[PDB]
From Swiss-Prot, chains A, B:
Probable proto-oncogene that functions in the epidermal growth factor receptor/EGFR signaling pathway. Activates both the EGFR itself and downstream RAS/MAPK and PI3K/AKT/TOR signaling cascades. It is found in: Cytoplasm; Membrane. All members of the FAM83 family of proteins share a conserved N-terminal DUF1669 (domain of unknown function 1669) domain of about 300 amino acids. This domain mediates the interaction with casein kinase 1 (CK1) isoforms. Therefore, it has been proposed to rename DUF1669 the polypeptide anchor of CK1 domain. Interacts with EGFR; positively regulates EGFR inducing its autophosphorylation in absence of stimulation by EGF. Interacts with RAF1; displaces 14-3-3 proteins from RAF1 and activates RAF1 within the RAS/MAPK signaling cascade. Interacts with AKT1, PIK3CA and PIK3R1; activates the PI3K/AKT signaling cascade. Directly interacts (via DUF1669) with casein kinase isoforms CSNK1A1, CSNK1A1L, CSNK1D and CSNK1E. It comes from the Eukaryota. This is Protein FAM83B. It comes from Homo sapiens. Phosphorylated in vitro by CSNK1A1. Belongs to the FAM83 family. The chain holds residues 118 to 286 of 1011 of the full protein.
Amino acid sequence: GTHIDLLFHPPRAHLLTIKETIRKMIKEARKVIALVMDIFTDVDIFKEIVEASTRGVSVYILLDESNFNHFLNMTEKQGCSVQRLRNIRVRTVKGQDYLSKTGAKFHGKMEQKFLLVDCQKVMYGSYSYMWSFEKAHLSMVQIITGQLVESFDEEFRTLYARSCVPSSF
Amino acid sequence: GTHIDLLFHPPRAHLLTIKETIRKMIKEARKVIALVMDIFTDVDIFKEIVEASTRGVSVYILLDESNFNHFLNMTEKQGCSVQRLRNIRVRTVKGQDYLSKTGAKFHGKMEQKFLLVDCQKVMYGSYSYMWSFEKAHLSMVQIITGQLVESFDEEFRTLYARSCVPSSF
Ligand SMILES: Nc1ccc(-c2ccc(CO)o2)cc1
Ligand SMILES: Nc1ccc(-c2ccc(CO)o2)cc1
């Protein structure tokens, strides 16, 4: 009991763009939005998420740690102190710890991108929320309903357990 | 009529790693292998592909254009002249053309990756074929069978039509 449709950017035969479909998914949220994202600088999508939170939807956002300052820089340019919105929680996730041949320890990246709404619908794929995915790159997503959604819910909870409050905050 | 399994790196409750499952998929190929990838420098996966082509399997590889010289350099360091293997065709795909802030003309990237074997099984997800995905990053893939695989076959053909002979050749 899993159904999957495919969408592309630039768009193919389907009516809506990927960005338009993300806005739709967010406006349709009744209870909860769970987002995992590597880089988030798109202001239009950010505005939709803030608007959802003001109507009482709980919003949980997991961002790649090494790219977090891109998001912070965007929210401050918009005049938003996101750390004051009680209905939104933002946390960061690191990759694996590894030691370089010059001995300096480093961590890698969380390479994972999905949007999970009301524990019932997922958008999963290669589209990141930044201007280069509108204008420059070719990407694709899946829209997923049914039994597979439960696996994305489990994986969200697992990343949430691992995540940390961002050090700026 | 689509079945989907998830695998993670580092691995969870599955017996094989993502890299071991990619090797398995290529060894099991009887007729055709179709690969779309952004960066390919993993020697062990390259060796499995060459071995499949010597068995008579037809191999089509589509690489992101900007990153192509990293692949060619790996093949040359292995002492292989990949140009001379007739059962493998390697071609490049570019993203969209666009103008920058200063008016200059650039192209973006093909942000897509998947492995399609015998028109019947797909591995789709965020794992790229390089050392950093083994040691540094967190990633995930889907193993897909059934009706959705036909959609990946159509998309491979569409990307193949767009693709170019690499300028380095
Ligand atoms: N001629 C042409 C134009 C665009 C694409 C396209 C959009 C998204 C993706 C990634 O699968 O490919 C393929 C071929
Ligand atoms: N504690 C812990 C360890 C590893 C992961 C992991 C690997 C790949 C992905 C992407 O979904 O997540 C999550 C939590």
